[model samples]
Target chain A: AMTEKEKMLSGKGYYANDELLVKEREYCKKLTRLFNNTLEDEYEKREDILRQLFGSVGKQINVEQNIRCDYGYNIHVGENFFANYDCIFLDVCKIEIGDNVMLAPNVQIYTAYHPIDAQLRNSGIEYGSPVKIGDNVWIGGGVIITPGITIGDNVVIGAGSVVTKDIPPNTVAVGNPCRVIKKIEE
Target chain B: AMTEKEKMLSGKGYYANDELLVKEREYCKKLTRLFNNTLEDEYEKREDILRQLFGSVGKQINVEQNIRCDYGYNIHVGENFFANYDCIFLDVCKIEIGDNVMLAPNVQIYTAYHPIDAQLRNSGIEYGSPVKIGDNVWIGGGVIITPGITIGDNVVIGAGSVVTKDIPPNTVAVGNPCRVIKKIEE
Candidate 1:
C-alpha cells in the first residue's frame, strides 16, 4: 500500500489532508510568510528565504512580492527566471521552468486538480500532474497554465491566455485553451 | 484646467509620477504591508486595516492575505465580499464590487491603462477607466477583469477568464475575452 504522498507524487488520486502532507505544507507556509514580509529594499533577505524555500533555483532569479505556492519544494527554475507581482503556483507535483523565463504579473501555474467527477471530488481525493516550460519563454500578464501542460522553447504567450494545452517551440500562443497563433521568426 | 489626478479620474492621460499621487500610493502601500503581515489568526486586525484602507467597505467582508491595490480609497466593496489569496486591484480609477461577491484565488482587476500609441506611452502618461461588478457575482481563479468592464448581477465567470467586455445579468461566462455561455434558471 502506497503512502498518500507517494500516491500524490505518482499522479494518482491521494488524500491531500494526510498528516505528513499537511505538516510539509505548514512548513512551506512559514517560509513563505517570512519571504513575503521582507521590506522592498531587503533584496538579500528575500533571496535567502527563496533559496531555503524552493526545491531548486538559478543564480539570477528575481521574483516580485506576494508570490504564493503550495509545497514550494516541488518547484524548480533555471537561470534568469523573473516573475512579476502576484504570482501563484500550486505545485503538488513538479513545476519545472527553464532558463530566461519571464512571467508577467498575476501569472498562475497549477499542477494540482481535483477529479471531475463530483462524487470523487467531494470525497476529498486530489491529483497532480507536472508542468514543464522550456528555455526562453515569456509568459504574459494574467496567464494561467493549467495542470499537465508543457510549453516549449522560444515561446511567447500573449496576455490573458488560459493555457490548457501544450504549446510547441518557437511559437506565439493566445486565448483560452491557448493555441499557437504564429511561429517565431528566428 | 485640471490637476494630474483630476485628469486621471476623468479618463485622460496624466502624469502618474505627480507628487500627490505618489504620496497617496505610498500611504496605501504602508497600510497594505501592515495588513499582509498580520498573523493568520488575527482576523480582527486584518478587518481594521482594510476598513481604514478602502474608501468604503461593508460590515461583513472577508479577504485573504496578500491583497495588493493602488490607492486603496479608489476601491470599494459591498456586504459579504470574500476574496481568496493574492487578489490584486489596480484601482487607478474606481473598482466597485457589489454585495455577496466571491473571488477565487489569483483574481485581478485592472482599471489602469497606458496609451496605445508607442510614442505616447513612452511619454510616461497614463489613463484609467472604472470597473463595476453588480451583486452576487462569482469570479473564478486566475480571472482578470480589464479596464472599463462591467459585470452584471448574478453572474458566474469560469476559471482563467479574461473579462474584456461588459457581461449581462444572470449569465455564466467562460474562457478568454469572457462571453456568456448560459443564463441562470433562477
Candidate 2:
C-alpha cells in the first residue's frame, strides 16, 4: 500500500490530511513566517532560510518577501531566479525551474487540484501534477500557471496570463487561456 | 449625520485615512496575525478568531491561514464558504459573499478604488466601492475581482480572470476583462 505522500507525489489523488504531509506544511509555514518577517537588509538570513526551505536552490536567487508555498521541499530552481513580492508556488508536487527565470509580483504557480467530482472533492481527496519552467523565462505580474504545465526556454508570458496548457520554446504567450502569440528567433 | 465608516458602508466615497478607519485596519491586522500563527490542528481557535475578525460569518466556513483584509467589519461571508491560502479581500468598503462560495488560492477581491484623474489621485484622497459575490460561486486561483462588481449566483470564474464588470447568473466567465463564455444549465 502506498503512503499518502507517495500517492500525492505520483500524481494520484490522496488524502490531504495525512499526518506527515500536515507536519511538512506546518514546517513550511514557520520558515515562511521567519523569511517574510526578516528585515530588507537581512539578505544573508533570508537566503539561509530559503536554502533550508527549498529542495534545491541555485546561487544568486533573490525572492522578495511575502511568498507562500506548500511543502517547499518539492521545489527546485536553477541560478539567477528572481521572484517579486507575493509570489505563490503551491508545490504539493515538484516545481522545477531552470536558469535565469524572472517572475513579476503576484505570479502564482499551482500544482494542487481537487477532484472534479463533487463527492470526491468533498471527501477531502486532492492531487497534484508537477510544473516545469525552462531557462530565460519571464513571467509577468498576476500570472497563474496551472497544474501539469510546462513552460519552455526563452519564453515571455504576459501579465495576468492564465497558463492552462504547455507553452512552446521561444514564444510569447498572453491572455486568459495563454496562447503563444509570437515566436522568438535565435 | 454619518461617520466615515458609515459613509464607507453605505457605498459612498469616503476618506480612507480617517483615524477610526486606520485604527480598525490595525485591529484587523493584529487579529489576522494571531489567526495565522495558530497551528493547523487549532480549528476551534481559528474559527473563534475569524468570528471576531469578520462582520459576520456563517457555519462550516474554513479560510486558510495568511488571509488579509482591511476593515474586517466591512466583510461578510455566508455558510460553507471555503477560501484557500493568501486570499486577499480589500474591504475598504463592504464586501458581501453569499453561501457556498469557494475561492481558490490567491483570489483577490478589491473594494478599494483610487481616483482616475492624476491630480485627484495624488491629492491623498481615495474612494471605495462595494463588491458582492452571490451563492455557489467558484472563483479560480489568481482571479481578481475589481471594485463595484457583482458576481451572480452559480458562476464559475476561470483562473487569472480580471473581473471589471458585473457578471450575470449561471455563467462560466474567463479572460482579462472577464466575459461569460457559457451558461450552465439549471
Candidate 3:
C-alpha cells in the first residue's frame, strides 16, 4: 500500500483529501502569502522565503508577487529564471524548469488531472503527471501547460496558448492546443 | 442623462476614470486585501468579507483566497459556487454567474473592452459587455471568458480555453475562441 503522496507522484489515482497532503498544502500557502506580501525593497527576505518554499531554486531567480502554487516542494527551477506577476504552478507532480527561463504574467503550469468520467470524478480520486521545460525557454503571458507536457530547449510559446502536448526544441508554438508554428534557425 | 455607473451597468461606453468609480474600486480593493490576508481557519471572517464585497452571493459558497475583482458591486454569484485560487474577475460591466458553478484556478472573467478603432481607443473611450453563465457550469483552470459572452446551463469549458463567442446549453467547449466539441446527452 502506497501513501497518497506516493500514489500522486507515481501518476496513479489518489485522494487529495489525505491528512498529510492537506497539511503540506497549508504550509506552502502560508509561505506564499508572506512572499506575496513582502515589500519591494525586501530582496534578501524574498529570496530566503522562496528558497524555503520551492524544492530547488537557483541564482538570479526573480518571481514577481502574487505567485500561487499547490505543494511548492514539487517545483524546481534553474538559474536566471524570471517570472512575471501572478504565475500559478499546480504541481501535484514534479515540475522541472531549467535555466534562462522567462515567463510572462499569468503563465500556469498544471500537473493535476481528474477522471473524465463523472462518477469517478466525484469519487474523490485524482492523478497527476510531471511537466518539464528545458533551458532558454520563453513562455508568453496567459499560457497554460497541461499535465504530462514537456517543452524542450530554446522554445518560445506565444501568449494565451493552451499547451496540450509536448513541444520540441528550437521551435515556436502558439494558440490553444498549442502547435509548433516554426522552428528556430541556428 | 446617465451617471458613469449607470452607463457602465447599461453596457454603454463610459469613462472608467470617473472619480466615483475610482473611489468605489479603491474601497473594494481594501476589502479584498483584508479578505486575502485572513488566516485559513478564519472561515467566518472570510464569508463576512465576501458578503460585503459582492453584489449578491448565496449559501455554501467557497472562494479561495487571492481572488481579485475590479468592482465587486458588478458581480453576482449563486448558491453552491466554488472558485479555486488566483481567480480574477475583471468586472468593468456586469458579471452574473448561476448556481452550482465551479471555477478552477486562474479562471479569468473579463467584461472590459476598448474601442476597435485606434482613434477612439486612444481617446480612452472604453465600453464593456455583460457576461452571464447559467446553472451547473464548470469552467476549467486558466479559462479566459471575454466580453459579451453568455454560457448556457450545464456547460463544461475545458482548461485554458479563450471563450470569444457564446456557448450554448449542455455542451462541452474547448480551445481558443472556444468551440462546442460535444453535447451532453440526457
Candidate 4:
C-alpha cells in the first residue's frame, strides 16, 4: 500500500489521483460560476451555493464568501461550523472536521508538506497528510494547523499557534511551537 | 516621545497617527470605489488603485482583485511588486515595503498585535505595531510577517515562514518562529 505521502507526491496536476483532480476541477469550475453569477446581496442564493460546496454540513454552518480553496470536495464537516474572516484551507488531502468547530479569522489548515531536503524540495515534488479536527474545536485567530495533525475533541488552540504535531483530546495549546499548556478538564 | 509599548497599547489603532488615519480612510474609500468599478479586463486600473492606496508606492505594482486590508493608507510600498493569488494585508498599523518585493500566493502581512492578557485581549481593545520590509525582498507562498518586525533589504523569507522578529539585511529566513538560516553573501 502506498503511503499518503507517496500518493500525494505521485499524483499529477495538483491532486492525489487523476480522478480527484477531475472532480476538483469541476467543483472549482462550479464554484467560479456561482461566485460570478451570485450577487453579493442575494443572501439566500449565496447560502445555497455554500451548502452545496461542503460535505456533511450541519445546521448553522456559516462561512463568509470570497473564500478560495482547492479540492473542496475532499473536505467534510459536522454541525454548527463557524469560520471567521479569511480562512484558507489547502485541503490537498482529506480534511475532516467534527461538530461545533469554531475557526477564528485567518485560521489556515494545510495538509500539504514539502520535502525538507533542498534537492528534493526544489524538484517540484510535494506530499500531503490528512488533517483531522475533532468536535468542539475552537481555533483562535491566525492559528495554522500543519499536515497530518489529528486534534482531538474540545481542543482550544490560541491565536498564532502553529500546530506542527498531533494534539491529544481536550487540551489547550498555544504559541509558535504549539505546546499543550493544560488539559481542558483540569 | 511615547514609548513603543505605550503607542502599541493605544486602541486608537497601530502604525498610524490621527493624521495618517484621515489619509488612510480617504484612500480606503477610494479603494473601495475602485474595487467596485474596475472592469474585469482593466488590470491596469487595479494596479493604479493599489498604488494610490499605499504610502510611498513606486512603479509596477500588481495586486489581484478582492485583496482585503484593514486600513489601506497606513501602508507604504516600493516599486515592481507582485503579490500573487489571494494576498491579504491586515494593516492595523503601518506596513512599509521596499522595491521589487515579490509576495507569493496567499501571503499575509499582519501589523496588529494584542496583549496576551485575556483581560486586555477580550476587552476588544487591540494594539498596533509597524511592520517594515526593505528593498528587493521576496516573501514566499503563505508567509506571515508579524507585528513590530523590520525585515532588512534583499531578504528571502521561505514559504510558510512566520516572521516574529527583526531580520538583518541579505538573509534567508524560514520556519514558524522565523529564523535566519543563512546570510546571502556567503
TM-scores of chain A in all candidate models:
0.98, 0.99, 0.98, 0.81
Per-residue alpha-carbon lDDT of candidate 2 for residues B1-186, written as tens digits (9 for 90 to 100):
888778777776577788998998899999999998886568899999999999999978788888898878888999888998889999988899998788989889988877789998887667788899998777888888999999998788888888998999878888888999988764
lDDT of each: 0.88, 0.89, 0.89, 0.72
Q: Mind giving the per-residue lDDT tens digits that candidate 4 earns over B30-109? A: 57456646778998778777766776577677776566676676678788877887677777677888889888987877
Query: What TM-score would each prediction reach against the true structure?
Result: 0.63, 0.85, 0.84, 0.59
Kindly provide the TM-score of model 3 when superposed on the true structure, using C-alpha atoms: 0.84
lDDT of 1 by residue, B1-186 (tens): 999999988899999999999999999999999998887657799999999998889998788778999999998999878787788999999999998777878889999999889999999989999999998777878888999999998788877888988999878888877899988753
lDDT of 3 at B49: 90
Name the best candidate (by TM-score).
2
In model 1, which regions exceed 4 Å deviation? B1-35, B40-64, B67-84, B87-104, B108-140, B144-157, B162-173, B177-186
DockQ of each: 0.17, 0.40, 0.37, 0.08
Instruction: Estimate candidate 1's alpha-carbon lDDT, on a 0 to 1 scale.
Output: 0.88
lDDT of 4 by residue, A1-186 (tens): 654334763442232445655576578658746843554345567567666766557766666445556767657888777775568778777789988777766898998777789887776667777889998677866798998899988677866788998999878887777999888662
Choose the strongest candidate by DockQ.
2
Cα error, residue A55 of model 1, in Å, equals 0.7
Q: Give the clash count for each candidate.
A: 0, 0, 0, 3
Q: Judging by DockQ, tell me the better candidate of 2 and 4.
A: 2
How far is B101's C-alpha from truth in model 3 (Å)?
2.1
Ordered list by lDDT, greatest first: 3, 2, 1, 4
Q: Which digits, one per residue and each the tens of the lDDT, describe model 3 over residues B1-186?
A: 999988888889889899999999999999899998897667789899989998999987788888899999888999877788978989888899998788889889999999889999988788889999998788889889999999998788999888999999888999877999998753
Candidates arranged by DockQ, highest first = 2, 3, 1, 4
Q: What's the TM-score, to 2 decimals, of chain B in model 2?
A: 0.96
